[PDB]
Structure formats: structure tokens, C-alpha cells
Design a protein around this ligand. Structure first.
Ligand SMILES: Nc1ncnc2c1ncn2[C@@H]1O[C@H](COP(=O)(O)OP(=O)(O)OP(O)(O)=S)[C@@H](O)[C@H]1O
Ligand SMILES: Nc1ncnc2c1ncn2[C@@H]1O[C@H](COP(=O)(O)OP(=O)(O)O)[C@@H](O)[C@H]1O
Ligand SMILES: [Mg+2]
Ligand SMILES: [Zn+2]
Ligand SMILES: [Zn+2]
Lengths: 598, 293, 608
DNA sequence: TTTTTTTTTTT
């Protein structure tokens, strides 16, 4: 029976302690109930590990039914709220209650949830798709009899419902045996609502099987959490749909957590500690990170110094209404077997929003955005590409010299103005794609050769070569002793499955992904006194590449490199003004990028 | 269903042994149980059933008044008339011309012919010995190679060789499963002077299985189907000839892709296309008799 | 050939009270040899619903019941499954309540019931049959109620409801009204946690192709799997369903056409083809642990000699193909990186040097091998191509060749007749191990960890032994680095070799164990040896001597460039040579077995 | 289950 459960839950809600609050033993739900009573909060994520701390039996009978219990709880709190501080007891609810999954259960996959778990608390993992937009869903329809001056209500449960034409008040009927009552969208109560589908990760599917979907009815407060094309983990009941004996089923979400980083979303706990400010304040914080990027790869001390600036990014101006981009693009022209597709695979996992694409397996409309028709409706809709899904992040395109030439000029737009302007025959718009690109390519025919100069063992039209702030150029000439150190590194790796312990240790990925997000939001400035130094440097460049027989095409787009490649450094050192010591670091980089040819 | 039995739903009253009428006509379930309006359902456990087919009969070709496409009629076979005829047969039906009763115009019905009579129009021990003695007789070789090209004469070597292709070697499987060929290939180079087309026609006619080709192609193709809008697989001739013999002329006319694929098919003896949505294998087991130019 | 039993009979050695009280007596089974009391307990220890029975036993026990069960399957299987719950309560009543109802499969040898979907006439209605054939579709698994549990918030009572449809053994059509007010006074509310649902699928068996009379479109039949028999069959199999045959009527508007639809309510499934070799005997594992200990010096060479006896010469190539058939060890570091553990072999040479033969043998030896050519294969048909469906019309990603063959082998013959725009589609799937596709409405990453065995005819038709190894191969130095072993199967016209070659092939035309390498490599594959500092300093030296041009030679050309990618092919060949010995620790005798292979496969000599 | 128009992948 349940009458005694409504007491065993009130006990737990009024009695529970917790120590990690950083203070003494306060009441995790004691404060919550007050906040809810003062209408400063809407949802109450009752955790289930905490009920499983003093009563591991109630948890057994929740995840077994989870449909009655989610109502007993919303009655317990309904009674406790007045004791802290219309006719139907649901029109005056103005809060909702959600179960946060118990830790003992294990996250299933979409294929695993079978009929033996209909009506139980489950947990699935998947990729979102086709998230709808918020629409008002009714809960308590309020009618009025204009004749007898009254008010009536009715509560809704199904995805459909039949209205009323009674005015069942026996007085109005008895006096006159006549009268109709209107519906009304003021006294009623709506609640947010949106449906979204989930699909399996195409990784965890039998070798050639088709992925299965599931439907999720997000509503209340979980709305607007998940974006389409996203890794997510959902916790909610698994019910059948109302209205022979076969039934179609949907997942009724109670909790939605983004698991993009392969672990969780820890943006709340993302704050750094003073014991880490220790490191960030050290003299050469910029040089520790550089060495702690893909440590499995020997050498390349300078490339890792630039792949960090790409992750931090310069600052972006807007004077007199003339936008200047504040991202950095980098190419890695180099010989075969120098671990470029390793560096890129690493920079993919070290970015909040990232994408990976291959030149030979992606078409030019699949990078930017494509217009596609629906044979069910005949209506053309837009569908973002790679550069759109990687809006505020990084995109990675290896095998960049092998991409078809008509599918490569579709990047010139995204690299300068950072929009995508579509004018096909359904749509006319400009999407926002503020991504910073990182690409890898092989020089001429697989291998650099010293007969032909540059620009002919690179084969990029100047218009695209100049879009890249740093076209880094790696070579591998055999060396009787360097090869020895490289081998003694790789064999250590294959023995221990780790890199050899140097003087210090690389930071964890989880920690760098936070060190950087803290280091983005500074926005330093530029001092006027430097405009004479910078200038001269730039001028000197226009001399060399004008009085040489190998140099690339340099233009007035190179100055903004020096400028935006230094506001990155000055952003690492946590300064709030660019200093003359970073301009020289930038200038050294733009020089250490073509020295591999001399 | 021939002898069907129903049952009420609410009060559980049965009314059994009901007999269906033959042909294509259903049954009108009561609505007066003696319970809601139509309380009757069928009890699947108690209903005797018999087979029934449904053919389609086209009128003979020499009786169309020759301005149009022949008309056809629909039949309805029963217990022992089922699986008695195969599409391509000539028959003589005795049926009851009748009408469908499943109750362009206002009072139009459908019509079929309930068939109740059907007709069809049209190795040995001692035969073994005429093979035995002929295989045993001293000059067994030339007797065949003489009677395998009556019209064309000259250079019996080009007829000596063709005698072997009709028999072929034997298929061996080493311990490794590394099977060996069991067929031969022949090329008759030279000007096209029509002296060879006769020979192709002969070897095709006198073969256990054989096809003479100059449509879909020889080897398999991948074609965009109008209905599916996707790619489907078309096994050509060399997959239909199982152990048989395939004859070819004008060895430079065949489609470039097709010639590549026939090269690989004579190489490996199977065709494996790995394209848009197609990854299959088709064993090609036939004999190539080619004529060049 | 007639399959008159699910267990292939040739080489198996290498009222309703009488029925219910006879089945119980049969299920006692204690007093004769205890065959089933050894199976009821066995399934209770595994938490199964159903047990498989042999009707061959029912015959010897009681012929009358064995005949009455193959001709009235419904009334007999509703009494079998009752006197089975009865007999499981007679062991553990606590377990006998965890499950709603038990089930009972069947297997054995039915007399005339072994039919095909072509012979399944309407004289088999309500009769156990045993249909054979290919599955050619599946349905979407969906629940189906068999009981509800309601609740009255006002009266605090609890009413139930039992459901039944035409797909039961009792067949009464109940209505799914879900009562909300039994008596008009009180309101109800369903409780899903306490109700009972079950699974439900619908597959379509179809007659075997080589058994059709070839004149028609082979016949089909509809099966209704259920209750954890569900996902037991995928499209393209060869199953032997053993289920009752049934006709299910209908009525649209009070007027029924006599025509019915007949289905097969399966109660067992069997894959006919045995598609694995893990069932080694203890005698076999004994032999294996003997052979792996006898001699650690010569077991690799002895393994490779017996690889392809049907071929003469080419000892090196057989050695390397064995190394392929074993494989290295895939290391995945802690941060998430990944290093491949496969070997990709390339063979070039003049015509008729048994290249296609080696390929066709590696196909049959290894499990999960896929063949492919150089013209019947496009650059996209190898990896993955985007298409749509006919029923739904929404796009999806059909898997190419090199994604089906995951954890397997892909054999590409005439790898040179493949256009330049088609090789490039491989550079991602041959090293990084996974395919990335960003097409119009598709953004996916498929796992394709495989290994490539490729054969290519040289340019100029024949290998001009005077030009150079680089001009005889068209591949660019970016693709030539992926394939870590390049074997130039040069053909030589010295009169001696032809003599023994003719001897060998002619002996072959006059007709270690063969079926033992299968088990031995299927066992030695799982071992994961670990490097040791005695050899890891020898490899780190042989590489730095390979990378130095001077130490090579003069009058010696290079077939392929030596990069930091051949370094971890040394490591792969080594830990694939210490997998034959079942050693688990690579030693200096390994890191030297795998260096001569390289020294031979990398450097060629030019003549004039 | 048909035309006609428009976008994108594929032989
Ligand atoms: N300096 C290095 N440190 C660590 N691993 C290395 C180094 N050089 C090469 N490797 C390894 O050698 C292999 C190189 O493969 P990739 O990273 O795919 O080469 P790549 O730079 O992509 O060459 P291309 O452009 O695709 S031909 C990987 O297994 C790397 O781990
Ligand atoms: N060294 C050899 N050992 C055994 N058989 C051989 C050898 N060389 C050629 N053969 C035989 O000759 C034929 C050669 O065909 P194959 O080598 O497969 O052609 P390709 O080299 O063009 O693929 C095969 O039937 C094979 O049995
Ligand atoms: Mg690469
Ligand atoms: Zn009123
Ligand atoms: Zn009745």
C-alpha cells in the first residue's frame, strides 16, 4: 500500500543531511522546499542515490514502478509546501518533480531497452536528432459558463481530449435547462513541451545493422537543453502510447545530461583552484601546455606551440562597422609519416565543439550546408554541414590536397567573413559559422623535392594560401642519431602504453580543457607605442618576399596575422595589454614556419 | 475455409458447422445473437480449410482479331487442381463462368471462371550401350569431330578442338580447397567472313547449356532502378550459364567496362562487384568460345 | 539430400487430464537415466523460460502421446506448458513464480512434417511442422500486453485484467479497452510498472534457391517469433523453424471473405550452418599445448612451410601472409589515442606467379574475408555510400566492402586497374582505421579496423628488370608507405626452376595438418605479447640503420621509403612472430626474425 | 504506381 509510503518519503525529505555543502550538516531538500514555496524555483531533482543511502528498499520499488511514486512525491511536496511558507489540486501546482537516476543502474543502449522494462526507470545514451521547438501543452483546461457566471476545470492526460458542453453544475441546469460554456486560454494552464528523437551511436551497432530510434517527450524544465546532432544521456520512464494489442512506445524524459566530452558536462564545477592558479601563474605556463599536447609524439616542439594558439584564438574587433575575424587557421604541409593525422585527431578531442572531416570523403555542400527535400511533404529544408555544426569550435580536414577542386572553393567564404550565404531554390539566408579550420596536406606528389621551388610543390592558389595565417611546413631528413631517439621513444610507448617520464608530466585532458576555457575570456588591448615596431616588421616582410626567388604570396592580410597571433599569447599570460615580448614570439613563429627548407 | 464455426463474444453462444459456398464469395455474419450488435467472431481452431490458387489465362495468339493486345480471363483452381500447370502451358479449361460476390459504372461486377476440369497439350539401360560401344570402338575420336560441322568444311583442327570443349576436363579440389578449372576457352581469330557465325550457332545448338551473344550485358552491372531510385545488380549471361558454353563474336565491340569484367571473369571464374550499394559474388561456370577479327 | 533431422544424422559422432498427467510422468525422468531432471535444474541455474525437448524420446516412452502431439499441437502444448510449471514448482516454488508462464520448444525427428515453404499445404493446419529456409526480412520488435494492473485512488482497491488475442494457443479476441471506470462511481488509473508485456516479431522464411524448381518465384511463409526468441534471426540466414501452423481469420464489416492468412507460431529456431570453430576438444587443446612447447626454435618456419602446399617457391611471401593471418597488438593509450595492429601486404609481379592463388587461399583460411577487384570496385563502394529507403524515403549510409570486413581481411586483386581518384578513398581506412563521411545529409564515422592484402600487375605488362623498382610501380610515395610489405614476385627464366615447378603442379594434377592451422591460429590470435628491453634496443637500432642510406649498399635501389611508419611495422611483425610460439614475451630471436624480412622486401637490385 | 521542377550523389 501507498498511504504509509507518503510518510516514509516525507521523513526522508525533512531529515536528510549532507556534508559536501562546504559547511556543516545542512538540509539538501530543506532549503529546496523553502525556495519552491517562495516561487523562486520550478524543478526539484530528487536524487535517488540519497534515498539509497538510508533506505535501499524504497529505491527497489521506485525503479520498479516509478509512475505511482512520481505522484506520491508530488503529493508529499504539495502538502509540505504550505507548512513551510482553486478547486482542483493541480491547477495550483506551479512546480514539478524529476528523478535523477540512481547510481547503481547502468546506462543501457537504445537497442537494449526491451518490453521487460515498460514502466520502469531506465537510462539511455544516444545522439539527438530532429529536436522540435517549444510549444504550449495544456494541463488544466478552464471553461466558463457565461450564463450562470461560473468557472469549471478539467485535467488532461492523453495526447488528445474531448472538450465539454455541459456546464454540469446542477444549479444552472436545474433553473433553466439550457446553457453553453466557452473554453478559455486565460484561466487554463499550459506547460512547455518539445519532442525529440534519439538514435544509436553508429559505433555501437552490429557490423552492418541499421540503427534504431526512440522518441523523447521533453517537457517542463528540461526543454532547450539539447541541440540536434549531439551526444546525450537521458533518464526517464519508458511507456506505451495511448489509443490491437501491439503498442508504440516513447521515453518520457526526467533528466537530460550532455556527454559531449565523453564523460559529462562539468561547466558548473569548471572553476579552477588556487592550487592550479599556482601553475597558471608560473613563469612559463605557456610552455607547459605546449609540451603537454599529444605527448605520445616526439619532437615538434614548435608545432605544438601554434596548435595551442589555434585553440585559444585572438580577439576580434568591429571599428566603424568593419568586422575582423578573431580565429586562426593553420595548415600542416609536410612529408609522409610525420604524425599529422595524429596531431589532428588529438586536437579533435581537446575541443568543446569539434568536427572531423576527410577531404576525399566529403562533398562541398556537405561541409557548408545542404538543401534537401522530404518525400513525405515535398518541402525543401536546410541541413547544416560540418562548418555549421562546429560553430564556436574547431574543424579538422586532413587529406586536404585531395579534395575536389570545386568542393574546396566553398571554404573561401567561411574563412574570412565566417558566414554561409545560401540562395538555392528553397531558402535564402546566411547561417553563422564562426569556426577555425585546421588542415593537413602532402606537398606535391607525396614528397617535397628540392628541384622545384615553393608554390609548385605546394599547389594552392594564392587566394587560398593567404587565408591561412600559418602554413606550417614539416620535413623529415634522415639523421643517424635523431632517428635513434625517435625509435627509443616509440618503443617505450609500445612497451608501457604511455610516454616516457620527462622532467615534468603532461596535464590531464580534462584539466587543460578547463585551463583554456578560462583563458579565452580576457580580451586584451593593443598599446599605441607598439604600432611603430609592428609596422617595421611587416615592412621588412614585404621586402624579403619581394626580393626572393622562393617566397610565397604575402599581402596586407599578413599584418593581421602578426596582430592576431600576438593577442593570443598575451591572452595566455593573462595580461590585459599586449606587450613587446609577445610580438617577437609571434614574429619568430611566422619565421620558424618556413625554415624547414633551409 | 469450407466448413466454418463461429462463436458469440459476450454470452459465449456457439453456432457451428456453418458451410461456406464455393467460389469467390464470402459470408454474412449474423448480428442477432439470441449481447451487443455484432457479437460473433470466428474460432480459428475449428475451421476446415482447403487450398486454392488463382491463375490467369491469355487467349491463344492465332485468334486475336489483330489490332490490339490479347484479352485474358481469371481462373480459380481448387483442392487437387492447384499446382498442376506452370506459366507457359497450353490448356483447355472447363469452368463455370460466374461473378464475384464480395458485397466506371453503376452496376458493374467482376467475373471469373471457376475451373472444374483442366487439360494440357503436349537415359535408359539399353541406350547406355550405344554410348559404351561407341566410346570403345577403335576410331572413336574422328567419328564425332566429323559430324559436328556438316555445312562448313576445311581444317578439321578447328573442329577437332571444339570436340573437347563439349566434354571438358574435371574439377579437382586439392586438400587446400584450392579448386581447379573444369572448362576451356577458344579463340578463332581471322577476318569476319560469316564462315564462323555458322559454327557459333551450331555449338550453341548442340550444347547441354549454351548462349550465343553479340541488352543488360555479359557480366554483372549496377543500374539505377527507376522505382528504387537506387542501384541494383544485374547478373548478365555468364552467371546464367551454369557449366554451359557462351559464344561471342566481334571481340572488340563489347563495352570497355564489360570487356574488363569478362577478362576478370575468365581469370577467376566468378564476378564480384563492390559498388554503390552492391557487394555480392556470382559464380561464373561456363565456357568461352570467342571469335576475333 | 533430405534433412530428416535438425541433428545431422550422418556424422553425429565425430479429457485434458490424461495429457497433463502423462507429460508430468515423462518429465520425472529420474528412474531411467535422469535426462531431463538434469535439464530443468540446468535452466533454473541459467534463468531460462523454455526448455527444448526431443520427441524421439517421447516416442520410446509413449507412442500414443507422441502421435497425438504432432497432430493436435495446440491442445497438447497448452497441457505441456502447464505440467511443466507444475514440475518446476516441484523443485523451487520461489523460482516458479518469478516468471509468468513457461514455454517448451521441440526438436528431434518428425516423420512427414519436415516440409519446405513450397510443400506446406493446408493439410498441416494445427500440426507441428519443421520449416527450413532463408530469412528475407524482419519486423520491428514491439511489446504486446498479456496482463494489466489497475488501481482505484478512491476505493484503494486493485483490479486486474487478463488479455488474449488470436496469436495465442487459446485464441479468444479480447478488447484493449483499458477500463477507466469499472463501476461508474470510482475512477481508475493504470499501473504500468506492475503490468506484463512481451516481445513480438514477424519474419518471412523463403524457400532455398537451389531447391526451387527454378520456373517460378519461390514460395514464402510468415513466422511470428516471441518471448525472447525474438532477435534470433537476421536477413540472409538458413534457419530451421519448428512451430505450429495456424490460420488466423478476420472480418471487415460483419462480412468475412472465406480467404484466410496462415502463419507459423514458432517455438524453436536453429541455424543450420555452423559458422565458427571454437569447439576445440580437450584432446585438441592438449595437442596445441604440446606443439607450442615441443620446439620454440622452429615452429614459425614449420608453420609457414605447411601454409599453401599447392604452391612452389615463395617462402618469404608465405611467411609474411602467415604474419598477416596472426596480426599484431592494437595499443590504445590512456588519453584516447590509438595505434593500429594490422599488416597490409602488396604483391607485384609478372603474370602467372600464383598471386590470385595466394589471395583465394587467404580468403578461405581466415574467417570474415571479403574479396574485391580493381575495376568492379569504386572509391565509394569500398567504404560507404549514401542512399535512401523505399518504404520511408529518408537517407542512410550503406556500408561498403571495407566496413563489412571489420576485424577481418580484404583481398584486392588487380589493385592497379583502379583509377587514381579511387585509391585516395583508402588512405584514411588503411591507417586510421575508421571511415569518416560528411555528405549532404549524413555525418558519420564507421569503424573499419581491417587488413589489406593486395595484388597488382606492374607497369609495362612485365617487370623490366633494368629500369628501377620505382618506375615499374605506378603508386605514389604516399600510398606506398601504407602497405608495409612490398613483395616483387619476379619471374625468372632459368631452366632449373621450371623443372621442379612442372613436377609439383603435375603431381598436384594426379590426385602441419591442414585443418589444424585453423584451430591453432584461432587460438594463438588472442595472446598479447609484450616487448622487452633486450630486443627493444635492437629494433631501435636496426631502424636507425635502415634509415641511413649509406649503410644500405651501392647498386641497390629502394622499393619504398623508410619512415617512422616502418618502425612500428617492425614492432608489429615481431609481436606477430612471438604469437606463433604462444610465447607472450618477445625476445631477441623475434626482433631478428622480422628484420631480415624487411631487409629483403625493401631493397631491390638493378641490372644492366 | 503517372507530370514537372530542383538539388545532390552516383554510375
Ligand atoms: N615523431 C613521431 N612521434 C610519434 N609517433 C610518430 C612520429 N612520427 C611518426 N609517428 C607514428 O607513425 C605513424 C604516422 O602515421 P600518420 O600519423 O597517419 O602520418 P601522417 O602525417 O598522417 O602521414 P600522411 O599525411 O597521412 S602519408 C603513426 O603511427 C604515428 O604514431
Ligand atoms: N609457382 C607455382 N606453383 C603452383 N602453381 C602455379 C605456380 N605458378 C603458376 N601456377 C599455376 O598457374 C596458374 C597461374 O595463374 P595465376 O598465377 O593465378 O595468374 P595471375 O598471376 O595473373 O593471377 C594457376 O592455375 C596456378 O595453379
Ligand atoms: Mg594521415
Ligand atoms: Zn452555467
Ligand atoms: Zn451472445
Amino acid at each position: 500500500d501507498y498511504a504509509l509510503e507518503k510518510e516514509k518519503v516525507k521523513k526522508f525529505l525533512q531529515e536528510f543531511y549532507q556534508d559536501d555543502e562546504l559547511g556543516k550538516k545542512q538540509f539538501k531538500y530543506g532549503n529546496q522546499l523553502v525556495r519552491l514555496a517562495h516561487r523562486e524555483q520550478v524543478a526539484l531533482y530528487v536524487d535517488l542515490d540519497d534515498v539509497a543511502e538510508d533506505d535501499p528498499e524504497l529505491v527497489d520499488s521506485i525503479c520498479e514502478n516509478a509512475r505511482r511514486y512520481a505522484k506520491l512525491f508530488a503529493d508529499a511536496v504539495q502538502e509540505l509546501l504550505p507548512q513551510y511558507k482553486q478547486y482542483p489540486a493541480e491547477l495550483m501546482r506551479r512546480f514539478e518533480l524529476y528523478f535523477q537516476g540512481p547510481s547503481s543502474n547502468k546506462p543501457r543502449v537504445i537497442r537494449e531497452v526491451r518490453a521487460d522494462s515498460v514502466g520502469k526507470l531506465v537510462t539511455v545514451r544516444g545522439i539527438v536528432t530532429r529536436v522540435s521547438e517549444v510549444k504550449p501543452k495544456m494541463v488544466v483546461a478552464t471553461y466558463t459558463c457565461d450564463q450562470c457566471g461560473a468557472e469549471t476545470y478539467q485535467p488532461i492526460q492523453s495526447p488528445t481530449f474531448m472538450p465539454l458542453i455541459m456546464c454540469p453544475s446542477q444549479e444552472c441546469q436545474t433553473n433553466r435547462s439550457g446553457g453553453r460554456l466557452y473554453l478559455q486560454t486565460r484561466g487554463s494552464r499550459f506547460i512547455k513541451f518539445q519532442e525529440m528523437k534519439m538514435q544509436e551511436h553508429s559505433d555501437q551497432v552490429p557490423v552492418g545493422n541499421i540503427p534504431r530510434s526512440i522518441t523523447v517527450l521533453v517537457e517542463g524544465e528540461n526543454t532547450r537543453i539539447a541541440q540536434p546532432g549531439d551526444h546525450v544521456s537521458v533518464t526517464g520512464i519508458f511507456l506505451p502510447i495511448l489509443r490491437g494489442l501491439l503498442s508504440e512506445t516513447y521515453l518520457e524524459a526526467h533528466r537530460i545530461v550532455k556527454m559531449n566530452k565523453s564523460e559529462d558536462d562539468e561547466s558548473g564545477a569548471g572553476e579552477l583552484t588556487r592550487e592550479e592558479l599556482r601553475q597558471i601563474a608560473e613563469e612559463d605556463f605557456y610552455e607547459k601546455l605546449a609540451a603537454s599536447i599529444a605527448p605520445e609524439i616526439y619532437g615538434h616542439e614548435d608545432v605544438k606551440k601554434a596548435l595551442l594558439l589555434l585553440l585559444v584564438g585572438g580577439v576580434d574587433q568591429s571599428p566603424r562597422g568593419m568586422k575582423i575575424r578573431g580565429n586562426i587557421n593553420i595548415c600542416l604541409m609536410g612529408d609522409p609519416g610525420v604524425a599529422k593525422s595524429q596531431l589532428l585527431s588529438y586536437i579533435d578531442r581537446l575541443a568543446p565543439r569539434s568536427q572531423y572531416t576527410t577531404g576525399r570523403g566529403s562533398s562541398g555542400v556537405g561541409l557548408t550546408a545542404a538543401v534537401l527535400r522530404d518525400s513525405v511533404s515535398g518541402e525543401l529544408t536546410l541541413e547544416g554541414g560540418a562548418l555549421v555544426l562546429a560553430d564556436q569550435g574547431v574543424c579538422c580536414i586532413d587529406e586536404f590536397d585531395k579534395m575536389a577542386e570545386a568542393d574546396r572553393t566553398a571554404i573561401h567564404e567561411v574563412m574570412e567573413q565566417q558566414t554561409i550565404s545560401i540562395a538555392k531554390a528553397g531558402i535564402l539566408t546566411t547561417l553563422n559559422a564562426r569556426c577555425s579550420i585546421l588542415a593537413a596536406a602532402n606537398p606535391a606528389y607525396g614528397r617535397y623535392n628540392p628541384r622545384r621551388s615553393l608554390e609548385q610543390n605546394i599547389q594552392l592558389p594564392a587566394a587560398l594560401l593567404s587565408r591561412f595565417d600559418l602554413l606550417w611546413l614539416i620535413q623529415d631528413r634522415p639523421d643517424r642519431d635523431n632517428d635513434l631517439r625517435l625509435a627509443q621513444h616509440i618503443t617505450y610507448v609500445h612497451q608501457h602504453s604511455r610516454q616516457p617520464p620527462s622532467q615534468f608530466e603532461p596535464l590531464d585532458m580534462k584539466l587543460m580543457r578547463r585551463y583554456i576555457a578560462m583563458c579565452r575570456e580576457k580580451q586584451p588591448m593593443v598599446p599605441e607605442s607598439l604600432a611603430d615596431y609592428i609596422t617595421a616588421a611587416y615592412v621588412e616582410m614585404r621586402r624579403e618576399a619581394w626580393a626572393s626567388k622562393d617566397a610565397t604570396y604575402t599581402s596586407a592580410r599578413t599584418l593581421l596575422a602578426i596582430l592576431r597571433l600576438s593577442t593570443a599569447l598575451a591572452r595566455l599570460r593573462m595580461v590585459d595589454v599586449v606587450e613587446k615580448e609577445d610580438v617577437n614570439e609571434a614574429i619568430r613563429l611566422m619565421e620558424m614556419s618556413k625554415d624547414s627548407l633551409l | 475455409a469450407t466448413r466454418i464455426s463461429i462463436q458469440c463474444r459476450s454470452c459465449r453462444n456457439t453456432l457451428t458447422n456453418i458451410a461456406m459456398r464455393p467460389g469467390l464469395e464470402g459470408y454474412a455474419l449474423p448480428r442477432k445473437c439470441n449481447c451487443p450488435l455484432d457479437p460473433y467472431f470466428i474460432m480459428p481452431d475449428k475451421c476446415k480449410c482447403v487450398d486454392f490458387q488463382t491463375l490467369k489465362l491469355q487467349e491463344l495468339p492465332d485468334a486475336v482479331p489483330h489490332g490490339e493486345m490479347p484479352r485474358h480471363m481469371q481462373l480459380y483452381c481448387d483442392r487437387y487442381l492447384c499446382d498442376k500447370v506452370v506459366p507457359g502451358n497450353r490448356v483447355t479449361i472447363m469452368g463455370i463462368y460466374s461473378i464475384k460476390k464480395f458485397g466506371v459504372g453503376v452496376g458493374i461486377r467482376s467475373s471469373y471462371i471457376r475451373v472444374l476440369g483442366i487439360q494440357v497439350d503436349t537415359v535408359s539401360p539399353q541406350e547406355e550401350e550405344e554410348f559404351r560401344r561407341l566410346a570403345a570402338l577403335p576410331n572413336v575420336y574422328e567419328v564425332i569431330s566429323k559430324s559436328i560441322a556438316p555445312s562448313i568444311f576445311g581444317g578439321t583442327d578447328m573442329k577437332k578442338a571444339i570436340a573437347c570443349l563439349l566434354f571438358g576436363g574435371s574439377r579437382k579440389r586439392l586438400p587446400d580447397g584450392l579448386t581447379r578449372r573444369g572448362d576451356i576457352n577458344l579463340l578463332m581469330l581471322g577476318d569476319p567472313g560469316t564462315a564462323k557465325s555458322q559454327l557459333l550457332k551450331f555449338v550453341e545448338k548442340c550444347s547441354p547449356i549454351g548462349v550465343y551473344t553479340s541488352a543488360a550485358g555479359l557480366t554483372a552491372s549496377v543500374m539505377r532502378d527507376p522505382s528504387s531510385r537506387n542501384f541494383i545488380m544485374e547478373g548478365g549471361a555468364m552467371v546464367l550459364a551454369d557449366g554451359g558454353v557462351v559464344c561471342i563474336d566481334e571481340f572488340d565491340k563489347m563495352r570497355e567496362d564489360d570487356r574488363v569484367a569478362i577478362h576478370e571473369a575468365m581469370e577467376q571464374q566468378t564476378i564480384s562487384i563492390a559498388k554503390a550499394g552492391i557487394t555480392t559474388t556470382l559464380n561464373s561456370r561456363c565456357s568461352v568460345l570467342a571469335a576475333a577479327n | 539430400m533430405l534433412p530428416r533431422s535438425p541433428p545431422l544424422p550422418r556424422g553425429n559422432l565425430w479429457e485434458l487430464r490424461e495429457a497433463q498427467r502423462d507429460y508430468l510422468d515423462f518429465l520425472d525422468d529420474e528412474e531411467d537415466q535422469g535426462i531431463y531432471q538434469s535439464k530443468v535444474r540446468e535452466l533454473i541455474s541459467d534463468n531460462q523460460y523454455r526448455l527444448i525437448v526431443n520427441v524421439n524420446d517421447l516416442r520410446r516412452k509413449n507412442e500414443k502421446r507422441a502421435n497425438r502431439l504432432l497432430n493436435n499441437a495446440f491442445e497438447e502444448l497448452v497441457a505441456f506448458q502447464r505440467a511443466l510449471k507444475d514440475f518446476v514448482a516441484s523443485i523451487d516454488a520461489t523460482y516458479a513464480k518469478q516468471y509468468e508462464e513457461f514455454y517448451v520448444g521441440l526438436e528431434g525427428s518428425f516423420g512427414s512434417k519436415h516440409v519446405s515453404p513450397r510443400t506446406l499445404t493446408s493439410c498441416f493446419l494445427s500440426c507441428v511442422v519443421c520449416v527450413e529456409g532463408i530469412v528475407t526480412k524482419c519486423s520491428l520488435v514491439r511489446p504486446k500486453v498479456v496482463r494489466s494492473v489497475h488501481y482505484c485512488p478512491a476505493t484503494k482497491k486493485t483490479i486486474e485484467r487478463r488479455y488474449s488475442d488470436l496469436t495465442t494457443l487459446v485464441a479468444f479476441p479480447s478488447s484493449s479497452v483499458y477500463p477507466t471506470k469499472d463501476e461508474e462511481n470510482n475512477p481508475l488509473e493504470t499501473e504500468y510498472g506492475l503490468s506484463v508485456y512481451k516481445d513480438h516479431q514477424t519474419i518471412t522464411i523463403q524457400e532455398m534457391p537451389e531447391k526451387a524448381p527454378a520456373g517460378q518465384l519461390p514460395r514464402s511463409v510468415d513466422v511470428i517469433l516471441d518471448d525472447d526468441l525474438v532477435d534470433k534471426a537476421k536477413p540472409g540466414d538458413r534457419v530451421q523453424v519448428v512451430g505450429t501452423y495456424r490460420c488466423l481469420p478476420g472480418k471487415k464489416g460483419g462480412y468475412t471473405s472465406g480467404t484466410f492468412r496462415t502463419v507459423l507460431i514458432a517455438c524453436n529456431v536453429k541455424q543450420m550452418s555452423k559458422d565458427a570453430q571454437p569447439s576445440f576438444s580437450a584432446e585438441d587443446i592438449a595437442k596445441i599445448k604440446k606443439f607450442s612447447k615441443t620446439r620454440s626454435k622452429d615452429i614459425f618456419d614449420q608453420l609457414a612451410k605447411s601454409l599453401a602446399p599447392s604452391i612452389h617457391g615463395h617462402d618469404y611471401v608465405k611467411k609474411a601472409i602467415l604474419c598477416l593471418l596472426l596480426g599484431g597488438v592494437e595499443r590504445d593509450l590512456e588519453n584516447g589515442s590509438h595505434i593500429r595492429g594490422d599488416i597490409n601486404i602488396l604483391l607485384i609481379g609478372d603474370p602467372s606467379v600464383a598471386k590470385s592463388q595466394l589471395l583465394r587461399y587467404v580468403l578461405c583460411t581466415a574467417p570474415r574475408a571479403i574479396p574485391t577487384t580493381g575495376r568492379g570496385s569504386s572509391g565509394v563502394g569500398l567504404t560507404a555510400a549514401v542512399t535512401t529507403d523505399q518504404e520511408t524515403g529518408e537517407r542512410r549510409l550503406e556500408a561498403g566492402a571495407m566496413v563489412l570486413a571489420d576485424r577481418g581481411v580484404v583481398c584486392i586483386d588487380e589493385f592497379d586497374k583502379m583509377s587514381d581518384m579511387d585509391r585516395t578513398a583508402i588512405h584514411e581506412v588503411m591507417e586510421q582505421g575508421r571511415v569518416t563521411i560528411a555528405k549532404a545529409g549524413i555525418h558519420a564515422r564507421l569503424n573499419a579496423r581491417c587488413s589489406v592484402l593486395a595484388a597488382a600487375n606492374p607497369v609495362y605488362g612485365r617487370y623490366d628488370q633494368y629500369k628501377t623498382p620505382m618506375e615499374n610501380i605506378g603508386l605514389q610515395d604516399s600510398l606506398l608507405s601504407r602497405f608495409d610489405l612490398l613483395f616483387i614476385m619476379l619471374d625468372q627464366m632459368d631452366p632449373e626452376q621450371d623443372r621442379e615447378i612442372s613436377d609439383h603442379v603435375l603431381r598436384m594434377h594426379r590426385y602441419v595438418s591442414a585443418a589444424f592451422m585453423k584451430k591453432y591460429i584461432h587460438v594463438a590470435k588472442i595472446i598479447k605479447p609484450v616487448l622487452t628491453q633486450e630486443s627493444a634496443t635492437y629494433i631501435a637500432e636496426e631502424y636507425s640503420r635502415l634509415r641511413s642510406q649509406d649503410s644500405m649498399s651501392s647498386d641497390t635501389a629502394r622499393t619504398s621509403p623508410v619512415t617512422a611508419r616502418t618502425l612500428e611495422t617492425l614492432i608489429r611483425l615481431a609481436t606477430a612472430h612471438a604469437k606463433a610460439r604462444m610465447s607472450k614475451t618477445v625476445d631477441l630471436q623475434d626482433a631478428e626474425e622480422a628484420v631480415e624480412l624487411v631487409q629483403y622486401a625493401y631493397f631491390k637490385k638493378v641490372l644492366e
